[PDB]
RNA sequence: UUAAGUUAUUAAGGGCGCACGGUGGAUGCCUUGGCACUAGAAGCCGAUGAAGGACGUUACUAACGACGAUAUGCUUUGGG
């Protein structure tokens, strides 16, 4: 997904980070209430956030 | 029939031999780990926060390895 992230503006990366952290929060609450059963979504969102923060840092290090 | 004399049978248990079991982990075979060296290289890191740790990170969860809230991992360049 790193290629897809790389085409987003910096603010959009920040917007996707927040919404991904919101989806991840919702998945954990579903899991704790025994309602998710689709447990592979948790790791997918987690690594997506990692990729989003990786690129944000990359560009914040190319600018400075 | 009696008298005199002689000598068995028993095995509660024991002994010896034999047969069949149990226990135990010697012995043989084996190696995942060691021991002693040879050759080439390297030896010491730290306020740009070390050595060593604590606590955490996996869908489930104790310990160990790995990793650090980007956590049982992220990007990239090559290999495969
Ligand atoms: Mg008897
Ligand atoms: Mg015996
Ligand atoms: Mg594990």
* Surface-to-core class of residue A2, CB atoms within 10 Å of its CB (0-12 exposed, 13-18 middle, 19+ buried): exposed
Experimental method: cryo-EM
- Please tell me the total count of domains within chain A: 1
Burial class (CB in 10 A: 0-12, 13-18, 19+), A16: middle
Q: Which domain holds residue A30?
A: 1-60
CA of A60 to the centre of ligand 2 (A): 81
Q: Confirm if A49 and A24 have CB atoms less than 8 A apart.
A: yes
| Nucleotides in chain B with any atom closer than 7 Å to protein CB | 58-59, 70-76
Q: In this structure, how many other beta carbons lie within 10 angstroms of the beta carbon of residue A52?
A: 23
Q: Which two tokens stand for residue A45?
A: 């969102």
Assigned token pair, A58: 């990359």
Q: For residues A18-49, b (16+ Cβ closer than 10 Å) or e, as one string?
A: eebeeebeebeebeeeeeeeeeeebeebeebb
């Amino acid at each position: 997904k790193a290629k897809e992230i790389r085409d987003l503006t910096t603010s959009e990366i920040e917007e996707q980070i927040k919404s991904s952290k919101e989806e991840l929060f919702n998945l954990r609450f579903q899991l704790a209430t025994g309602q998710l059963e689709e447990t592979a979504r948790i790791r997918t969102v987690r690594k997506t956030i990692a990729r989003l923060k990786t690129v944000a840092r990359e560009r914040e290090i190319e600018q400075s």
